[PDB]
Ligand binder design. Structure first.
Ligand code: CDL
Ligand code: CDL
Ligand code: CDL
Ligand code: PC1
Ligand code: PC1
Ligand code: 3PE
Ligand code: 3PE
Ligand code: 3PE
Ligand code: 3PE
Lengths: 120, 80, 42, 105, 171, 347, 98, 48, 110, 169
């Protein structure tokens, strides 16, 4: 859909205008869920190699958590960037084409006739 | 570095000649003073027509005639 | 779901290896004079 | 996924053989160099959806340069009418179309 | 579409240079030296107009200036030129290197009787400049107006209003 | 195989796919497919038995035929357009031939008839390469030519792939043929949303590659190629039964798992374009895929089939196999649905 | 369009339908595949020489080389089939039905 | 020749552009003899 | 055209000499002969090595086909790139020969 | 008739394909593909592709079909109705194509094809002191760097691939 937008500046994971956006917090609940996915990957990695699940290799579990939070932070940055580009293109297109987007005259319900269907 | 070289020249002189000639072919054009003239002769060879320029009035380096002094010359090719 | 068509199908081998299901002999005849029987392998 | 590595790194891996109007050895033009240059300069940057309906004339001229279908259709029509009039005897070819005119230069 | 506009057969009549290719090749360096100006006016007009019909008169000047080239050979130095292009004409590739003494006699005779100097190696392949009076074509490709491009992006990049708006996700 | 030669040949497979992904000239597209086929043939003949040679012969014939049809589509594009840009095609005949060639490369029905054979004939790692990495290059070419793809052809190929991959897996007991008919059904789902929203095509491809890589990695870690040897897993490694349970319930697309994520998004893009019958029939047909997934979960996780006595020896040895990225791929193929709006990174 | 393109496309379709209808031999299939490649070579060549598109004159050679390497690979596969059954018959390659 | 034919513009360009197009071989030698055709269109290729 | 005439003359003289060599001694009435090989009736054993040397020929012949435009390519004005790619193609043919060596591909027909 | 000569060669070309596509035996099919390669080379040569036609001889015929006939002679031990019916079917379809496009000077199987001799589509100029096709193939070393790299790498990998799969270990 938006493939012509990111074609003049190709293969850019986060462009410069993405720095105009507020970055996700470190207490982003999406980022905390990705850290929980890292913790689950650590527990499954202990389980498949028959280690004690909660105890064995805390350095490995912590690197799982760190790696998922590290990748997921940039993935959330790019997510917020692409939705920002989506809405920017939408609003610029609505502004540049007023003839396709007229203001609908909103009628109050004193004029608006609705057909009554009795439940009996 | 010298006993191995005499060993391989005693056993396999075909391959020593092969790798030596290949090494000369690799390294010797970068050390030759005449590699520049190969480029200069290939660009001096006029396959196409020399499409002339419209004289705007200010082109001091472009000649009006082939026998004019300004322009690219080939004295280096006739002399070498 | 075995049918009449797919009833001769047996399951494949466990290592997925099927069993593999000679060498040349030449008669250099009398055509001194010696007859030779060669078993060559290439 | 068109990971445009060539535009990202600035390298030119295959853009040179892409079109007929590109830089050729010894400046050899294609037979439809001008038509393809006009179609590309028309359809540049405006996107394919607008390029189909807004650059139809340049693209039709370029396709008719490439395959020469209208030209060969016209030559078919002229040669067929000429052969019909030769069969009817109402036409005779001139000496310069019979090979009796001692060519120009 | 339109009707193609061709010049008449009277517009194409000119006194031709009816000599063979060994005559032309044997006289080629002095022809490029002497007939430089109408030739380069013609070829500048030919690469600028991209249309032979717009280049006819200059072409006639070429066909007028070549003949005055050859007449001035025929008035003065017809016999060394004749021997020289005969020796050029024998070769199936028409080598210059087979014919250096007939070339030397022709160059001597032309340099003495007409003062023409044969161009050196490199001169005829130079890019020259041409002073003209015809105007530069503003549209040699006969092209129409290009389509207007799409409107660009402008303005600051605001965040997405209430996030992704994907069914129930608040971010 | 020499491990250096294995590394160079796998880098050449990757090099062919990357050359398809990055090139702007159709000849280099064709060259990337040729390099990909040429380098993946030794991966299929890794064990040197007649089934691998038969599978490599069938794979060579189908991919060679598709490469010739691809080059004919390219050459007809050069006829009717005079250029070589990897973009839309300028003739519906070249578009049809290229769509047929890419359907042959992907093994979409009715050009599916090589996929359950070849995957059966080759090892699990080469089957993993064939069912994950070998989809990427033709889906990239389909991504870049979608202004020229016929709608009726691509949706016919899509629904025929989904139905035939649904019915084909119901009759199987071999795990590789199950993953192959799963491949045919999922490629139908990817191409059904291609002309509507190709970001959802990329989403379905990524989630499919994750789930298929998880299932092949589980099959390699347990050394099981049949249903009935996969059913010995609870007496050997009880965690692997949980993992194949959650991954097969994900591949059927049951919420709240992440394999519900693509197809739902596909329906989310097919009803915007006023197609209601088609994604409904697609979703009802995917119940067949879920049925033989449930058959495998009943054989492996939710019941306990009888084992043998020699299993007691294997209790004394832990798995030394490098189960590469198996916890990561298991977590990603199950618990990723709350992160569904991450898909905008594929736009 | 031009008349020779009709025959080269019809040659490609004849070699296609020969390659899409096997009789018994795998070698005859490889010959039909290389006939398809040869017709692609001829058709690419006649276009590129007609259009005077200079840079694509190296294109059919490339189309030769890769595909001939492809042919080499196909021959090798046939030989391995011939080293299992003694013949290159396509009906011997039916073990993957089960 | 093309007098009897209804709806025929003599000298009608098949191109929408008014730019000069290089004349094709069949455009030039279409109405001439077969010997002139062959000498202009395969003469250099068949020359030895 | 002269080439096609020359090919037709060479092919016609070859076909005429083959027809004479197959049919001039057929005119004699010599005798009918009943006439009832190192291998007797054993089927031809396949050689892997003859196939490998033919495939090695085919691949080196493709590399030769790449090498064939060098007397034209030396005329370019991008000579550093041309020389680099020429040395790279001959070096890759040499690496193909070296790998054919070291994995014993050139053995018993060395 | 001589103005149609490339067309005539192309007819023989199609006939040659109905030679081996009907698949009589892989050795007669090899012979039919050799004859097809020679006449398609003649088609290439009559547009000005001298180097490409000699690549058809040296590399396709003298290089690759040699290996096809060589491999084929090491199989199919030395000594049909479907072949003969397929051959006459392809020949009659091709002569119906010839009859239609000659009686009408136009035909449409899938695309519209003119029925004039294919000399009409040529150029009326000169290329100077070079073959344009020769210089475009010479540009493989100056402009075709990526193409040389990927082709030579594919040939090296092809050597490695044939040595891996023909070993059985
Ligand atoms: C959490 C979820 C994922 C857990 C995975 C690992 C579980 C595991 O190994 O458990 C064993 C382990 C105890 O085992 P153990 O005694 O050490 O040794 C192994 C036993 O010997 C085990 O004995 P055994 O293996 O010899 O034999 C018994 C057999 C028994 O098994 C059988 O007999 C076969 C199976 C029986 C039938 C099936 C039952 C259901 C199982 C599958 C679940 C399906 C539903 C899941 C959801 C629906 C979708 C499918 O197997 C097991 O019990 C294997 C252990 C695993 C059991 C639990 C499996 C969880 C993974 C799957 C669900 C979660 C992921 C998918 C979710 C999808 C979306 C919701 O359990 C735990 O420790 C549980 C965790 C408790 C502490 C949690 C602490 C949280 C701290 C949070 C803060 C720090 C992080 C901060 C993050 C944010 C940073 C920014
Ligand atoms: C960006 C995309 C990244 C894609 C994945 C890249 C890695 C996998 C591919 C290659 C591979 O298989 O490597 C083995 C792979 C481990 O896979 P494995 O063998 O199946 O794991 C079993 C145990 O880890 C085996 O444990 P061990 O006893 O052998 O030693 C412990 C080991 C020791 O680790 C080290 O030694 C690492 C430090 C040295 C690295 C090299 C320095 C030179 O610790 C770990 O490897 C911990 C695992 C960390 C997680 C791995 C996956 C990373 C995240 C992938 C993307 C997740 C995105 C989620 C988004 C969700 C929402 C969309 O990776 C590593 O060993 C290094 C991980 C470094 C992660 C850095 C992430 C940020 C990069 C910027
Ligand atoms: C000064 C600087 C520092 C400041 C620090 C300030 C913070 C201090 C506290 C630090 C900790 C903060 C933690 C994050 C904030 C709270 C997030 C939250 O609750 O969102 C409410 C979220 C929406 O509710 P709300 O009332 O509209 O929003 C309240 C806030 O405004 C929420 O804010 P919002 O509206 O902006 O949230 C954005 C959006 C709000 O959400 C939405 O827009 C709705 C869509 C949510 C996802 C729905 C997916 C549906 C399909 C999958 C179903 C999952 C299966 C269930 C779980 C299976 C077993 C694990 O969130 C998402 O889209 C992210 C996905 C959900 C993850 C939430 C965070 C989890 C972190 C820990 C993970 C541990 C496992 C949790 C369970 C795994 C599944 C979530 O609730 C749900 O969706 C219900 C599901 C449960 C959510 C997770 C609860 C987090 C705490 C768990 C602790 C206990 C763990 C027990 C062991 C592990 C499990 C067995
Ligand atoms: C340019 C290269 C060289 C060209 C070829 C050589 C030049 C000479 C060619 C003609 C030579 C004479 C005819 C062939 C030799 C006959 C030998 C022979 O055994 O003949 C007996 C044969 C048969 O005679 P017969 O009946 O006694 O048969 C003997 C065999 N029995 C009895 C068992 C049946 O004679 C012929 O066939 C006669 C052939 C024609 C005679 C010559 C005609 C004119 C030729 C000019
Ligand atoms: C291994 C490969 C080693 C050699 C790489 C190319 C060296 C060279 O001369 O490049 C210059 C050439 C040509 O550069 P150039 O400087 O001649 O460019 C001038 C412009 N033209 C061509 C119009 C005259 O190639 C490039 O610059 C780009 C192509 C190669 C890019 C690198 C590919 C690496 C692949 C690794 C896998
Ligand atoms: C883990 C992810 C690691 C990403 C590292 C950086 C890669 C990169 O720079 O990728 C560029 C690409 C954006 O480039 P773009 O031109 O927009 O792509 C068009 C695709 N149709 O970026 C992306 O496409 C980002 C998303 C890739 C996600 C792949 C795994 C899921
Ligand atoms: C850098 C320039 C470009 C180099 C690449 C291009 C080379 C062009 C020639 C192509 C050669 C292709 C084939 C090469 C194969 C080499 C490997 C080899 O042959 O090893 C085996 C051999 C022993 O032979 P064997 O196996 O016993 O066979 C029976 C015969 N006795 O073992 C040997 O004989 C040992 C061979 C290696 C030692 C040769 C040393 C020559 C040194 C010359 C001087 C230095 C030249 C500069 C280049 C560096 C060379 C190291
Ligand atoms: C828009 C998208 C653009 C592209 C983005 C990236 C796409 C990535 C696609 C991944 C495709 C993976 C293909 C398979 C791996 C290739 C290497 C290989 O062959 O690995 C198997 C290897 C073989 O070892 P072997 O000893 O032969 O094992 C058999 C038993 N003896 O070793 C083994 O058998 C070890 C066992 C475990 C192997 C697990 C490998 C998992 C690889 C996939 C990870 C998931 C995908 C990446 C994340 C999402 C990206 C989209
Ligand atoms: C409709 C699409 C096809 C149109 C052309 C049809 C040509 C005539 C062939 C019809 C089928 C005849 C037949 O029996 O073909 C089967 C044969 C392979 O089977 P085989 O084992 O040889 O014999 C058993 C008999 N079925 O198969 C063959 O031998 C087929 C070889 C086909 C080669 C094409 C040659 C040109 C055909 C005309 C142009 C297309």
């Amino acid at each position: 859909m938006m493939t012509g937008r990111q074609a003049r500046a190709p293969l850019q994971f986060l462009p410069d205008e993405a720095r105009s956006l507020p970055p996700p917090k470190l207490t982003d609940p999406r980022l905390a869920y990705i850290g929980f996915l890292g913790y689950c990957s650590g527990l499954i990695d202990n389980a498949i190699r028959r280690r004690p699940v909660l105890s064995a290799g805390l350095h490995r579990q912590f690197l799982y958590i760190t790696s998922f939070v590290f990748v997921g932070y940039y993935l959330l940055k790019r997510q917020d960037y692409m939705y920002a580009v989506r809405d920017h293109d939408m609003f610029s297109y609505i502004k540049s084409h007023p003839e396709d987007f007229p203001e609908k005259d909103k009628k109050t319900y004193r004029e608006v006739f609705e057909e009554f269907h009795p439940v009996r | 570095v010298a006993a191995f070289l005499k060993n391989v020249w005693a056993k396999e002189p075909v391959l020593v000649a092969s790798f030596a000639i290949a090494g000369l072919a690799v390294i010797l054009p970068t050390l030759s003073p005449y590699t520049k003239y190969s480029l200069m002769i290939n660009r001096a060879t006029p396959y196409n027509y020399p499409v002339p320029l419209r004289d705007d009035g200010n082109m001091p380096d472009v000649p009006s005639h082939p026998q004019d002094p300004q322009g690219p010359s080939l004295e280096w090719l006739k002399r070498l | 779901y075995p049918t009449k068509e797919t009833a001769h199908w047996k399951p494949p081998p466990w290592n997925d290896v099927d069993p593999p299901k000679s060498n040349l002999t030449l008669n250099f005849g009398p055509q001194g004079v010696l007859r030779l029987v060669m078993e060559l392998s290439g | 996924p068109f990971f445009d590595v060539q535009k990202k790194l600035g390298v030119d891996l295959d853009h040179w053989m892409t079109i007929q109007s590109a830089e050729q050895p010894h400046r050899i033009p294609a037979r439809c160099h001008a038509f393809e240059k006009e179609w590309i300069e028309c359809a540049h940057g405006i996107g394919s959806i607008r390029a189909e309906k807004e650059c139809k004339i340049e693209f039709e001229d370029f396709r008719e340069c490439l395959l020469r279908q209208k030209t060969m259709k016209r030559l078919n029509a002229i040669k067929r009418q000429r052969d019909k009039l030769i069969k009817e005897g109402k036409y005779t070819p001139p000496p310069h179309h019979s090979g009796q005119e001692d060519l120009r230069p | 579409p339109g009707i193609v506009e061709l010049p008449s057969l009277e517009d194409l009549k000119v006194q031709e240079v009816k000599v063979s290719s060994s005559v032309l090749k044997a006289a080629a360096h002095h022809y490029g030296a002497q007939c430089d100006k109408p030739n380069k006016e013609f070829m500048l007009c030919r690469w600028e107009e991209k249309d032979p019909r717009r280049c006819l008169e200059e072409g006639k000047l070429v066909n007028q200036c070549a003949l005055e080239f050859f007449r001035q050979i025929k008035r003065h130095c017809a016999e060394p030129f004749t021997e020289y292009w005969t020796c050029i004409d024998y070769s199936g590739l028409q080598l210059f290197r087979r014919c250096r003494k007939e070339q030397a006699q022709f160059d001597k005779c032309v340099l003495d009787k007409l003062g023409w100097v044969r161009p050196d190696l490199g001169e005829l392949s130079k890019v020259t400049k041409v002073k003209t009076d015809r105007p530069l074509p503003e549209n040699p490709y006969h092209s129409r107006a290009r389509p207007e491009p799409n409107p660009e992006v402008e303005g600051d990049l605001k965040p997405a209003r209430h996030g992704s708006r994907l069914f129930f996700w608040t971010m | 195989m020499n491990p250096i030669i294995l590394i160079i040949i796998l880098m050449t497979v990757m090099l062919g796919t990357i050359i398809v992904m990055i090139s702007t000239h159709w000849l280099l597209i064709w060259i990337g497919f040729e390099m990909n086929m040429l380098a993946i043939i030794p991966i299929m003949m890794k064990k040197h038995n007649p089934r691998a040679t038969e599978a490599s012969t069938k794979y060579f014939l189908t991919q060679s035929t598709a490469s010739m049809l691809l080059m004919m589509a390219i050459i007809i594009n050069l006829m009717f357009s005079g250029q070589w840009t990897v973009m839309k095609l300028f003739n519906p005949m070249a578009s049809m031939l290229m769509t047929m060639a890419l359907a042959m490369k992907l093994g979409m029905a009715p050009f599916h008839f090589w996929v359950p054979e070849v995957t059966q004939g080759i090892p699990l790692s080469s089957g993993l390469i064939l069912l994950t990495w070998q989809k990427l290059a033709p889906m990239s070419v389909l991504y870049q030519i979608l202004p020229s793809i016929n709608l009726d052809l691509i949706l016919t190929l899509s629904i025929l792939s989904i139905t035939i991959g649904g019915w084909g897996g119901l009759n199987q007991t071999q795990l590789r043929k199950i993953m192959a008919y799963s491949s045919i059904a999922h490629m139908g789902w990817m191409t059904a949303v291609l002309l509507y929203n190709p970001t959802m095509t990329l989403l379905n491809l990524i989630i499919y590659i994750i789930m298929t890589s998880t299932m092949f990695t589980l099959f390699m870690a347990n050394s099981t190629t049949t249903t009935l040897s996969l059913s010995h897993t609870w007496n050997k490694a009880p965690i692997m039964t949980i993992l194949v349970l959650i991954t097969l319930l994900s591949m059927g697309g049951l919420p709240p798992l992440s394999g519900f994520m693509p197809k739902w998004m596909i329906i989310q893009e097919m009803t915007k374009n006023d197609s209601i019958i088609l994604p409904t029939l697609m979703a009802i047909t995917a119940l067949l895929n879920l049925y033989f997934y449930m058959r495998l979960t009943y054989s492996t996780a939710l019941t306990m089939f009888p084992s043998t006595n020699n299993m007691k020896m294997k209790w004394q040895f832990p798995t030394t196999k490098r189960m590469t990225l198996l916890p990561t791929m298991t977590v990603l193929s199950t618990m990723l649905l709350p992160l569904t709006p991450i898909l905008s990174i594929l736009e | 369009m031009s008349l020779v393109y009709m025959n080269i496309m019809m040659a490609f379709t004849v070699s296609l339908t020969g390659l899409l209808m096997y009789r018994s031999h795998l070698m005859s299939s490889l010959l039909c595949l290389e006939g398809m490649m040869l017709s692609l070579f001829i058709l690419a060549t006649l276009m590129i020489l007609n259009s005077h598109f200079t840079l694509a004159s190296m294109m059919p050679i490339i189309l030769l080389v890769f595909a001939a390497c492809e042919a080499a690979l196909g021959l090798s596969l046939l030989v391995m089939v011939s080293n299992t059954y003694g013949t290159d018959y396509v009906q011997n390659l039916n073990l993957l039905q089960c | 020749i093309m007098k009897d034919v209804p709806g025929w513009k003599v000298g009608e360009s098949v191109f929408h552009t008014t730019r000069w197009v290089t004349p094709m071989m069949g455009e030039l030698y279409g109405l001439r003899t077969g010997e002139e055709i062959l000498s202009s269109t395969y003469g250099f290729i068949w020359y030895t | 055209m002269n080439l096609m005439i020359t090919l037709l003359t060479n092919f016609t003289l070859a076909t005429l000499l083959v027809t004479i060599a197959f049919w001039l001694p057929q005119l004699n009435v010599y005798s009918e002969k009943t006439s009832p090989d190192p291998m007797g009736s054993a089927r031809l054993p396949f050689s892997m090595k003859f196939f490998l040397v033919a495939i090695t020929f085919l691949l080196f012949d493709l590399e030769i086909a790449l090498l064939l435009p060098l007397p034209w390519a030396s005329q370019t004005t991008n000579l550093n790139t041309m020389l680099t790619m020429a040395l790279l193609l001959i070096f890759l043919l040499a690496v193909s020969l070296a790998y054919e060596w070291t994995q014993k591909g050139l053995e018993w027909t060395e | 008739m001589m103005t149609y000569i490339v067309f005539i060669l192309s007819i023989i070309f199609v006939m040659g394909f109905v030679g081996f596509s009907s698949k009589p035996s892989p050795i007669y099919g090899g012979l039919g593909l050799i004859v097809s390669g020679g006449v398609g080379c003649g088609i290439v040569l009559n547009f000005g592709g001298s180097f490409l036609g000699l690549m058809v001889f040296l590399i396709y015929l003298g290089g690759m079909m040699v290996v096809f006939g060589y491999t084929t002679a090491m199989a199919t031990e030395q000594y049909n109705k479907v072949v003969l019916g397929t051959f006459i079917t392809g020949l009659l379809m091709e002569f119906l194509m010839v009859y239609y496009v000659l009686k009408d000077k136009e035909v449409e199987i899938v695309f519209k094809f003119n029925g004039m001799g294919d000399w009409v589509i040529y150029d009326t100029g000169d290329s100077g002191f070079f073959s344009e096709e020769a210089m475009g193939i010479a540009a493989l070393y100056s402009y075709g760097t990526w193409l040389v790299i990927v082709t030579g790498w594919s040939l090296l990998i092809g050597v490695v691939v044939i040595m891996e799969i023909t070993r059985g270990n």
